[PDB]
C-alpha cells in the first residue's frame, strides 16, 4: 500500500542458485530509526556515484523506500513495526539494505533485527574486519586484523526461545526438566527464567559450508571453527565437530599432523586453506595478540556477536563495520551500529557502516567494479583524515566533516 | 587417605559469617595439571617469605596438598580425578588454593573446574583485572583498566544442562519444546543439540549483593551490570533487573536523573557509587575505547569468562590474572591460565596468576600485610623487566628469569 514501485526498473532474480541482476536493478533500503536518517542519504549518493563511474552510465539503481522501525509506525499505524509487506518486498527483490533499527521496549516486542534474519532465514551473518589506515585504535597494530566473520544466524540462545521466572510458562519448563529429564543442576528452580539454545547439525553445515566456499573464492588461508564446546559440549561442541566433518566431507580434508587441524586444497589455487578450532573466550584474548594467525572465522550466534563487536572496536571500526545477512534466497545488509538518537538529524553520523555494507551489496550484486569503487573511496577518505566527528575527536591533524561531507569525500577519492 | 594432615596447624573456622583464622591455619593446595609442578613450589615460596615478612614468625601456613586431575589418579586409582575427599577437605579448611586442572576428554566428564565451584557453592568468580607497570600489552593504554570482575558462578548455560543431537533425550526435551510449550522457532528441530539457561532470582542477588559490599568495603566508583537482556530477556535481562532492584531494596539506591543508573551512598566514605548497566557485546567494545569508566562488573558466567579473558588480554596479563571462587562458606583461589603442557616440568612458566591468586586468598583471609608484601614484591618484579619468557620474548630490556626465579625475583621487590 504505501511503498512506490520504481517506473523505470526491474527486479533480480536466482536461477540456478545464481543471481541475475538487471542494469536497472530495483533495491528495497530501509531509513533506519535515529541516525538513518543521516547516513541512508550519503550511502545512496555514495552508490551511485560507484555505480556511474564504474558502468559509465550504462547501469542504475533504481531505488525503493520500504519500511520497518519508526518510520514503520509512521507510515502504517500505531504498532506496525515490522509491515508483512516488508517481508514480501525483500523477497520479491532478492537484495536489500538498511540503516540502523531499534525494537522499542515494554510492548513484549522480539528483536526487529533478528526477525528479519529469522523470517527470511538469512541464516550467514557476514562480518568482515579489517583495519583502514588513518583510523584511530585503541590497539598498537590494527593492521594485523583481516579477518571474515561467518556468524550463524538462525539458532542458538540467540533465538529468543525462553520463558519468565514465577511464570506458568517456566515453572512447567523446570518441572518437566526436574520430574522427567532428570535435571538436578538448576541451583535455584524457583523465581528463575528459563532459556533454550539449540544447535542443529543442518544449521551448522550451512553456515560452515558457506565459510570454506569463502575462503576459496577468496583465497583466503583458514577457517577457524570459534566455540564454547568444553562447557556445552553438545551444541557449540557439536558445532564444532559437525564443522570439522563438513570439512572432510564435501571439501576433502586431510588431518595435518596428529590433528585435530586440516587442511583442504584450494580447488583454484592450490593453497592449503587450514581448518581450525579456538575455544571461544581464550579466542577473545587471540584476536587481541596473535591476530595475524586468523582469516575466516565460523561460529554461533552469540559468539559471533561478540567477535564482530570486539573485533570492530580493536581496528577503530566500531562506526564503520559492514554487515550482510545472507540466506540461499535472499539478502539483506546493514549498518551495524546502533541508531545514536542523541546525534540524529544532525548530519554528524559516521556513514562508513551503511556504506562499506553497500560495497558488500553491490559485490553480491556482482558488481564487483562498483563495490572496489567504494572500498578505493573510504581508503582515500579515512586515510586523508577526512572525517567525522567520532574518528577526528580521537586524533590530531585530521579535518572534521559533517556525514554528507564525508560521503563527498569517499565519492572524491574514487 | 592419602592426604597427611599437618601435624603443627590448626583449621580456620567460620563464626558470624567471618572467619577466624589461626596464626598457624592448614591449608590445603592442589598442585595442578601440567605447569601446576613449575607454579605452586614458586607459590608456596612466595607466600611463605610474605608471611614470615610480614609477621615476623608469629604466623605460618601449614601447607596441606590436596588431590585433584592427573596427580589425583596417580594417587589414587584410575579415574578417580576428583575424590569426594578432596571436596571435604576444602569445606573442612575453609580456604584452599589450586594450580591450572584440566578436564579429560572422551571419557563424558564435566569440567573438573566447575564440579568444584558447584559442589561447594562458591557462587562468585571474582578476577580483579589491572595493569602491572613494565607489562608487555597489545593496546596503547592498558594503565585505564582497573576493573573486579564478579561473574556469577553457578548457574546460567555454564551449568552443563544439556542434551546430544538424536539421543532419545534430546528427543523428547525438543517434543515437549514443540508439542507442550508450543516452541515454533526451533529452526531444525532434527540432529538438534539442546541446551538449558536458568538464572533465578536469588542467585542474581547474591552475586550482585557481594558486588555492591565489595565496591563499599573498597571505596570503588560504580558497580556496572553486563548482561546480554536485549535478546535474553528473562535470564541475562532479569538479571539486570534484579541486580538493580537488590541496589534499590538494601542500599538505597537513587535514581541518577530519568534513570535507568543508580547511586548507592558509600557508608564509610560518602562517595556516591553509581550503578548502571551495559549490553554484553557493546561492553566487550567499551572495555577498550573507554576503560577508564568502569570498575566493579557484575555479569552471569558465560559473560564473566569472556570478559574476565578478554581483560586480562588486554593489560598483557593472560598469565598473571588472579582469581577466586568464593561462596558463603568456602573459597578456593585458582591460578586462572591453562596447564600449557608443552612447557610443563622445565621451570619455565609464569607463576604470577597462582600467587596473585595467593595474595587474594591471604586478603581473604585477613592477612592483608602479606597480601600487600605479595602485590609489592610483583610489582617491582615486573617493573624491574626481570620476568618469565612470556613476558621477556615480547620486550627488549629485560633480564629473562625461570618460573622458581621470578618467585625469588617477587620476593626480593617485597
Ligand atoms: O546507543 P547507540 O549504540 O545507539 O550509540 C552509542 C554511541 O555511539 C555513537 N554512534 C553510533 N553509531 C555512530 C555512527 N555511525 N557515527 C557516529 N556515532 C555513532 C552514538 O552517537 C552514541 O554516542
Ligand atoms: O592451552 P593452554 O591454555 O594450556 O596454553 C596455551 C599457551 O599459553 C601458554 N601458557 C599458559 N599459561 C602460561 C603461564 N602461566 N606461563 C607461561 N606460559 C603459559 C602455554 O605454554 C601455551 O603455549
Given at each position: 500500500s504505501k511503498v512506490v514501485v520504481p517506473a523505470q526498473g526491474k527486479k533480480i532474480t536466482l536461477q540456478n542458485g545464481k543471481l541475475n541482476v538487471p542494469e536497472n536493478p530495483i533495491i528495497p533500503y530501509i531509513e533506519g530509526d535515529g541516525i538513518g536518517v543521516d547516513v541512508t542519504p550519503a550511502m545512496l549518493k555514495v552508490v551511485d556515484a560507484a555505480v556511474e563511474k564504474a558502468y559509465k552510465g550504462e547501469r542504475k539503481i533504481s531505488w525503493m523506500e520500504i519500511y520497518t522501525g519508526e518510520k514503520s509506525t509512521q507510515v502504517y499505524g500505531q504498532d506496525v513495526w515490522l509491515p508483512a509487506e516488508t517481508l514480501d518486498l525483500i523477497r520479491e527483490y532478492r537484495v536489500a539494505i538498511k540503516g540502523p533499527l531499534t525494537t522499542p521496549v515494554?510492548?513484549?516486542?522480539?528483536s526487529l533485527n533478528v526477525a528479519l534474519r529469522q523470517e527470511l532465514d538469512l541464516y550467514i551473518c557476514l562480518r568482515p574486519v579489517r583495519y583502514y589506515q588513518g583510523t584511530p585504535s585503541?590497539?598498537?597494530?590494527?593492521?594485523l586484523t583481516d579477518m571474515v566473520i561467518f556468524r550463524e544466524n538462525?539458532?542458538?540462545?540467540?533465538?529468543g526461545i525462553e520463558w519468565k521466572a514465577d511464570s506458568a510458562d517456566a515453572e512447567k519448563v523446570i518441572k518437566f526438566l526436574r520430574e522427567?529429564?532428570?535435571?538436578?543442576?538448576?541451583?535455584?528452580?524457583?523465581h528463575c527464567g528459563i532459556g533454550i539454545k539449540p544447535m542443529s547439525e543442518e544449521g551448522t553445515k550451512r553456515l560452515v559450508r558457506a565459510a570454506i566456499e569463502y575462503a576459496i573464492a577468496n583465497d583466503r588461508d583458514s577457517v577457524t571453527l570459534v566455540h564454547k564446546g568444553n562447557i556445552m559440549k553438545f551444541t557449540e561442541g557439536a558445532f564444532k565437530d559437525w564443522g570439522y566433518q563438513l570439512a572432510r566431507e564435501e571439501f576433502g580434508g586431510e588431518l595435518i599432523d596428529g590433528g585435530p587441524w586440516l587442511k583442504v586444497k584450494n580447488?583454484?589455487?592450490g593453497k592449503e586453506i587450514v581448518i581450525k578450532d579456538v575455544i571461544a573466550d581464550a579466542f577473545l584474548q587471540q584476536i587481541l595478540?596473535?591476530?595475524?594467525?586468523?582469516?575466516v572465522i565460523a561460529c554461533m550466534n552469540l559468539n559471533g556477536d561478540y567477535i564482530s563487536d570486539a573485533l570492530a572496536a580493536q581496528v577503530g571500526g566500531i562506526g564503520i563495520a559492514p554487515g550482510a545477512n545472507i540466506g540461499d534466497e535472499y539478502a539483506l545488509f546493514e549498518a551495524t551500529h546502533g541508531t545514536a538518537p542523541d546525534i540524529a538529524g544532525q548530519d554528524k553520523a559516521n556513514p562508513g557502516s551503511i556504506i562499506l555494507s553497500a560495497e558488500m551489496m553491490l559485490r553480491h550484486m556482482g558488481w564487483t567494479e562498483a563495490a572496489d569503487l567504494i572500498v578505493k573511496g573510504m581508503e582515500g577518505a579515512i586515510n586523508a583524515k577526512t572525517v567525522t566527528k567520532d574518528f577526528e575527536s580521537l586524533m590530531d591533524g585530521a579535518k572534521l566533516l559533517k556525514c554528507s561531507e564525508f560521503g563527498d569525500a569517499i565519492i572524491e577519492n574514487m
Open positions: 515494554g510492548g513484549g516486542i522480539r585503541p590497539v598498537k597494530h590494527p593492521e538462525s539458532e542458538d540462545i540467540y533465538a522427567e529429564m532428570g535435571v538436578k543442576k538448576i541451583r535455584f528452580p524457583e580447488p583454484n589455487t595478540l596473535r591476530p595475524a594467525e586468523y582469516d
